[PDB]
Subunit: 269 residues, 3 copies
């Protein structure tokens, strides 16, 4: 594994929100995808452009307390302030006593832990979160990755009934990352596609007994992910994904997986 470096910035955005960006003026919600191989180290030069204390907390990856992103471990950042955070990762293997150490690989996420409360409640609602993917050697790589975040009642801090919509062509291998935040449980459902409830979202082969599902209950800070072959056995189309809690889907927690025919049309639009 490699040693990698990046810049990250925390910024306030024009409608009361907050975002992470790989450069000033280009903060997104969700924050930028961070992708690593088991074994890589990542040093993040972090800058808080905001006038409240901010920080960076990550799930799953190895980090010392000094990079925990919390007041407890004196790991937050002053308004306008600067901090270098270090995340490490490791491949799995047998310990000397026979036991198997798990591996860093998986779908994870990062978020603020100090805006509003000492658990980042205001930071998170306002949009200070994003995805982390860690790859194991030999993992299947996708053509695309879309991140879907159920934050309280909104997908990706979008107004009710505003997608996001996601585009692909028949036969593409599309990866989704699915993170939940806030107060509520939800239930993630995709029309016309299904996945394995295990680490990668795909069966290892014919001995993998994992449940095959198209609907999964998630809570605040759960993350998981999966890959599908777009259109596989179902064909082109506007395939809805949504929370399947009835009041939630009614109130617009819905969006589209736009699967285009080879030439580039969809039937019925």
């Amino acid at each position: 594994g490699e040693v990698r470096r990046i810049k990250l910035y925390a910024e306030r955005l024009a409608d009361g929100q907050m975002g992470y960006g790989l450069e000033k003026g280009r903060a997104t919600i969700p924050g930028p995808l961070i992708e690593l191989n088991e074994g890589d180290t990542l040093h993040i030069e972090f800058e808080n452009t905001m006038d409240v204390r901010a920080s960076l907390h990550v799930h799953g990856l190895d980090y010392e307390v000094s990079s925990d992103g919390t007041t407890l471990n004196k790991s937050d950042v002053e308004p306008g302030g600067t901090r270098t955070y270090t995340w490490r990762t490791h491949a799995p293997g047998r310990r000397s006593d026979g036991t198997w150490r798990a591996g860093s690989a998986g779908y994870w996420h990062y978020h603020d832990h100090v805006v509003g409360t000492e658990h980042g409640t205001g930071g998170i609602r306002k949009g200070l979160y994003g995805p982390v993917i860690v790859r194991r050697k030999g993992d299947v790589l996708p053509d695309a990755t879309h991140t879907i975040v159920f934050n309280d009642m909104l997908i990706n801090n979008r107004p009710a009934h505003s997608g996001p919509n996601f585009e692909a062509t028949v036969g593409d291998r599309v990866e989704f990352v699915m993170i939940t935040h806030g107060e509520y449980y939800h239930t993630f459902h995709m029309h016309g596609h299904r996945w394995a409830d295990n680490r990668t979202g795909m069966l290892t082969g014919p001995d993998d007994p994992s449940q095959v599902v198209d609907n999964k209950i998630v809570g605040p800070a759960d993350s998981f992910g999966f890959q599908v072959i777009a259109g596989e056995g179902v064909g082109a189309g506007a395939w809805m994904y949504h929370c399947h809690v009835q009041s939630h889907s009614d109130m617009g927690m819905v969006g589209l997986f736009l699967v285009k025919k080879t030439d580039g049309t969809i039937p019925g639009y």
Copy 2:
């Protein structure tokens, strides 16, 4: 891979409820069990015998957009109308990219997507849902199958504290399909029995590390299944099943799995 047909009907029932049925005047809640082998195609000639728009959406199985049963896909049925829903399945197998294509096998369900709201909140509430089972070559087959739906605060739309109960004899292989609907998460618990948290609800052998459970958290549109040897290790008796959300069990989300001795008797109460 057999090609098969059934007829289905949506009809209003007593106390303003709605059910799918295999014949006019025999609609049930939950709907009739639909069972298929991986490879099978099912054509459902569906008649809406009601005064409102109605449809059929299935989870897990392969379907074209023209069969997603939603408004957007012009796939609902007009009052008194007729529509031909086609559900396909597939066996698992190797793709040319080296990857393992999952398979349709699973505990799944179907339900209205259009009554009440564009997400079928009204139809699901009234009882327009039933179970689907897609089996894999070699799967163990039950002596009976019983379907348990937590729909909001009701079980199978029964009044509080009124079942359903299910009867088996000791040593029966009994399969349960557990589906959840509506607004609320639940936790499904069975006294006296337990299952594996995986595709078939049974461990594939000693190297299957799946959690063995007797209680599982579910949310709206989650479906899972399992089989048990009735009263294995525990004996005959009235074995309660219920949601374990305390206010929920208190308010009525309780039923009985009545497990008789071979002479048909059951201890006590």
Copy 3:
């Protein structure tokens, strides 16, 4: 497996309208005492209800007949001041004569009352009548220490909000947690700096176990799981939070610390 074991257990009132199980009169705790068995063991519990209300013992996961259900339905509760012997049994996994694999009993489980307040023990559970149960399979790795975290409604182990509990270890210790949930709410359990496999033992079997590896898990009333970590592994010593991740729940004090000490005893910096 397998031995016959016998204990005594008492249900008693505690201070602030609470109630608990204990191994001796006057020693009730919340959670109740950890019961640990090997697959194949039978345990006989000599249970005495010292309270003025009916109480029972009902267990998840293990083998019991209806006479040990702990319920009103099965005539299986205990009258005020009365005694009953409950029996729990366990079995190893095995091939059945129908060719299938019988699941074994081993795992992370719990017991609680089923009859205080309501016929579902809502008031008993509310007031502290619950405790952990662990069943081992031959060959299971044993830990240096076991800690029980119960999210009971909004409180952790019926402790007042923002009151821990905290658990201490040394870097390299093999530490077991048992995580149980009760009451009315869903929760999501999270631990900083550590992770586990979502499976029977919380540890992957080897390179081909595809179980999801997580540091966050949603749980509902009566769910129980467990896992073991090597404290500090890859992350070092530190004051490591665990908490519910439901934002309003963490904010309101559903939090505690896994205090992991260097081999020299220190936690930097503190």
